[PDB]
Write a protein that binds this DNA or RNA. Structure first.
Length: 255
DNA sequence: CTTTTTAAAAGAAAAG
DNA sequence: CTTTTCTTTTAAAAAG
């Protein structure tokens, strides 16, 4: 009953996440950057209708908010299969080039997995849902990520922007990985015996026994839920001696 | 949609 | 004429 025991840790039961211990992020620009406002390419009604429900949901969640900004980047509808289920994709390349580079601290998967000893053969794999959206953006940095949104001829006058760390932003993966490492530093200290690998939003908990893995998992879920992160109950792989993690199949200490 | 770069195919230029 | 190899421009494929 892992689901019922931890209502707050699961995206299915605890609502959209919010990393409450992390200060809103300020995104430093390069020394010479100036705002760039790129025109929105005309979108078909079919693409707009497909994207609308996603935008409205983000506005209701407060992840998107109206704004007037000197910055603007294009929104691109990306049809997964076909004329159905669209998803908004922002082209942030002109913003990415104006933001100051940070050192990439996310380890490559091969090196991260080198830290998995054979003694720990019981695994748990959690996938954090909408991880980036759990981190707030400082209000000074929100205008950077603005885009245009039009109910064809009326309604939201023009631009929207993000109040949370956005997809397509070049530093999101690193900033998220660093924030979650800060938030789980204690957990690691209270559980010296457990192994925890973090790859941005993909976590792997490794234990020596099935009980340890069960007690460790309970504690990890409890901590993540309290911190404001949410895991995907659907994808979770709990206390198994065989799991899929970062494209590998973990078993017998192999791969 | 637009920019990036990666790759493969086509078109000049040496050469005997 | 034919083979060689060098340039260059046309096309796919990642990407936000």
């Amino acid at each position: 009953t892992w689901l019922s025991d931890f209502p707050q840790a699961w995206a299915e039961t605890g609502g959209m996440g919010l990393a409450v211990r992390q200060a809103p992020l300020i995104i430093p620009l390069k020394a010479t950057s100036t705002p760039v406002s790129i025109k929105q390419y005309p979108m078909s009604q079919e693409a707009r209708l497909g994207i609308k429900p996603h935008i409205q949901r983000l506005l209701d969640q407060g992840i998107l908010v109206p704004c007037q900004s000197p910055w603007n980047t294009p929104l691109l509808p990306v049809k997964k299969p076909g004329t159905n289920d669209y998803r908004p994709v922002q082209d942030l390349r002109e913003v990415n080039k104006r933001v100051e580079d940070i050192h990439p601290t996310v380890p490559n998967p091969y090196n991260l997995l080198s830290g998995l000893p054979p003694s720990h053969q019981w695994y748990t794999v959690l996938d954090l849902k909408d991880a980036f959206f759990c981190l707030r953006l400082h209000p000074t940095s929100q205008p950077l990520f603005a885009f245009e949104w039009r109910d064809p001829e009326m309604g939201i006058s023009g631009q929207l922007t993000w109040t949370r760390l956005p997809q397509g932003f070049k530093n999101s993966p690193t900033l998220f990985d660093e924030a979650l490492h800060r938030d789980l530093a204690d957990f690691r200290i209270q559980h010296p015996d457990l192994i925890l690998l973090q790859y941005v939003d993909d976590l792997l908990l490794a234990a020596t026994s099935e009980l340890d893995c069960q007690q460790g998992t309970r504690a990890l879920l409890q901590t993540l839920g309290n911190l404001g992160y949410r895991a995907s109950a659907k994808k979770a792989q709990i206390c198994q001696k065989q799991v899929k993690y970062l494209g590998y199949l973990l078993k017998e200490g192999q791969r």
